[PDB]
């Protein structure tokens, strides 16, 4: 119910090994050359599949 001992710095840093976050899955737009997510509409030109949306 209650911590018997306080946690050291090394132990806390070891537990925080996997609490990072990933890097977005993005690539450049064939039309405007801007970055965009795969399988998503381009927010800078409103394109998807080479068509206006």
């Amino acid at each position: 119910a209650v911590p018997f001992r306080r946690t050291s710095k090394a132990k806390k840093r070891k537990r925080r090994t996997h609490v990072k976050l990933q890097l977005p899955g993005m690539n450049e737009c064939s039309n405007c050359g801007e970055y965009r997510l795969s399988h998503h509409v381009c927010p800078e030109c409103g394109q998807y599949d080479g068509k206006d949306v």
Partner: peptide, 8 residues
């Protein structure tokens, strides 16, 4: 671009 697509 990385900052724009990270939803934090």
């Amino acid at each position: 671009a990385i900052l724009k697509y990270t939803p934090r």
